[PDB]
């Protein structure tokens, strides 16, 4: 598929910056409960427009890549995510979303 621009925003809990953390330490671990979201001191979510892409594997990849990238400048351990998609039909204006949640030590 054609590259598309990654977008991504970190929402924070609190007002404190954090120093930077290494990206490539970051943990990081699928979000599968409702629970998992208790102790995070923020959000990050990204996403991509679908265009020609074929391979939704490739764009939630490409979403974690800048999600773990994003947390990281903000200060997170450890991050859990997943991969959401449209609910209606999926187009070329479609995006592909991801919503993290990140957690210091
Ligand atoms: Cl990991």
Same mark, same amino acid.
């Given at each position: =598929?054609?590259?598309?621009?990654?977008?991504? $925003?970190?929402?924070? &809990?609190?007002?404190?910056? *954090?120093?930077?953390?290494?990206?490539?330490?970051?943990?990081?671990?699928?979000?599968?409960?409702?629970?998992?979201?208790?102790?995070?001191? =923020?959000?990050?979510?990204?996403?991509?427009? $679908?265009?020609?892409? &074929?391979?939704?594997?490739? *764009?939630?990849?490409?979403?974690?890549?800048?999600?773990?990238?994003?947390?990281?400048?903000?200060?997170?351990?450890?991050?859990?995510?997943?991969?959401?998609?449209?609910?209606?039909?999926?187009?070329?204006?479609?995006?592909?979303?991801?919503?993290?949640?990140?957690?210091?030590?």
């Amino acid at each position: =598929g054609s590259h598309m621009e990654t977008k991504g $925003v970190y929402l924070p &809990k609190y007002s404190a910056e *954090l120093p930077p953390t290494d990206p490539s330490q970051v943990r990081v671990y699928n979000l599968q409960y409702q629970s998992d979201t208790q102790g995070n001191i =923020g959000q990050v979510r990204t996403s991509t427009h $679908v265009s020609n892409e &074929k391979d939704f594997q490739k *764009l939630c990849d490409k979403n974690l890549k800048e999600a773990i990238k994003l947390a990281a400048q903000h200060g997170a351990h450890e991050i859990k995510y997943i991969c959401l998609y449209p609910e209606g039909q999926i187009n070329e204006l479609s995006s592909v979303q991801l919503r993290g949640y990140a957690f210091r030590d």
